[PDB]
Each structure stands twice: as structure tokens, then as C-alpha cells.
């Protein structure tokens, strides 16, 4: 490797084999995620659309101007999930 | 404008005809910044 002569080891059969102990180098990594839920950009210049007929609808009132309530994101295997405002009823409705 | 439905808006008056006041650009690491006219209150509001 580069300008050196090093050993290369993958010890799994000489040691840690047919025993009751786990092999190291299989550590974990903790990562945190953050998602906003019900923000609403209070600005006339920011609530726009990129084209003319972006998402047409038959209703007389396009149900996309009202402030949203929930958030959508993927699951661990690719399933759709949803976190509405109702899911926060366990933190804001406490005696604290 | 270069196309018909470029930036449509539900408002009756498109807030893109009025003269602008600020400027937007990127930071050192790629963050959005803004320099409005209010930031010039240290140069034009002097006794000079």
C-alpha cells in the first residue's frame, strides 16, 4: 500500500470461530434526523408555483394553499409514513 | 418574462413587478445570505 509493506489480516476462522463471542469491527453508528412538521412561509413572494398547470384540480378551491399539518417520509424498507400534528398529543397535553 | 406561466401565484397582484430591495448570494460554505436596504443604515444615516 502506497510506499510500505504491511500485513493484511481477516481473522475469522483461526479465532472467534465456533465460539460464544462476537467478532469486533462490527460496531454501530448513531445518527440523528430532524424534520419540520407544520411550518408556513408567511410571505407572498415565497408562496408561488413553478409552472402554469403544475397540479390542476377540479375543485374550485385548490387544497394546497392552506397550511399543511403532517410530514411524509420513507420507511426503513421504502414504505410511506406520515407524522401528523395529532402525533404530538403526548408532549403538549402534559401537566408540564 | 420568457414564458407564459413562469411563476404563477394565487394572489391577484404578482409580487414580482415591484422594485426589489435586497440581494441574495451564497456564503463561504454555501448558505443563503441576504443584504437588504436596512443594512445600509450605518453609512447613509451619519452626519457626513
3-class secondary-structure state, position B4:
coil
Strand partners of residue A83 = A71
As a whole number of angstroms, the distance between CA A46 and CA A40 comes to 10
Query: Which residues of chain B have a Cβ shorter than 8 Å from any chain A Cβ?
Result: 4-11, 15-16
DSSP A86: G
Residue partners of B33: CB distance under 8 A and separation at least 6: B24, B25, B26, B27
Q: A60 — alpha (psi -120 to 50), left (phi > 0) or beta?
A: alpha
Question: Looking at the partner chain, which of B4, B10, B15 has a beta carbon nearest the beta carbon of A52?
Answer: B4
**Residue B2 and residue A44 in contact, taking contact as beta carbons nearer than 8 Å:** no
Taking CB atoms within 8 Å and a gap of at least 24, the contacts of A34-38 are: A35/A71, A35/A73, A35/A83, A36/A71, A37/A69, A37/A70, A37/A71, A37/A83, A37/A85, A37/A88, A38/A67, A38/A68, A38/A69, A38/A85
| Record: contact A48-B5, CB cut-off 8 A | no
To the nearest whole angstrom, how far is the Cα of A45 from the nearest Cα of chain B?
A: 6
As a whole number of angstroms, the distance between CA B21 and CA A31 comes to 41
3-state SS, one letter per residue, for A9-55: CCCCCCCCCCCCCCCCCCCCCCCCCCCCCCCCCCCCCCCCECCCCCC
As a whole number of angstroms, the distance between CA A77 and CA A67 comes to 29
Neighbours of A59 (CB within 10 A): 6
Q: What is the resolution of this structure in A?
A: 3.7
| Record: contact B15-A44, CB cut-off 8 A | yes
As a whole number of angstroms, the distance between CA A49 and CA B10 comes to 9
Q: B11 — alpha (psi -120 to 50), left (phi > 0) or beta?
A: beta
Diameter of chain B measured on Cα atoms: 49
As a whole number of angstroms, the distance between CA B3 and CA A47 comes to 19
**Residue B15 and residue B9 in contact, taking contact as beta carbons nearer than 8 Å:** yes
| Record: contact B4-A51, CB cut-off 8 A | no
As a whole number of angstroms, the distance between CA A67 and CA A42 comes to 10
Amino acid at each position: 500500500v502506497g510506499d510500505k509493506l504491511v500485513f493484511l489480516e481477516a481473522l475469522e476462522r483461526r479465532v472467534y470461530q465456533a465460539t460464544r463471542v462476537a467478532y469486533p469491527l462490527i460496531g454501530n453508528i448513531d445518527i440523528t434526523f430532524i424534520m419540520p412538521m407544520g411550518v408556513f412561509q408567511a410571505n407572498s413572494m415565497d408562496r408561488y408555483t413553478r409552472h402554469a398547470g403544475d397540479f390542476s384540480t377540479v375543485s374550485e378551491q385548490d387544497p394546497r394553499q392552506f397550511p399543511p399539518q403532517g410530514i411524509f417520509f420513507y420507511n426503513k424498507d421504502g414504505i410511506l409514513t406520515q407524522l401528523t400534528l395529532r402525533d404530538a398529543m403526548g408532549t403538549i397535553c402534559h401537566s408540564s
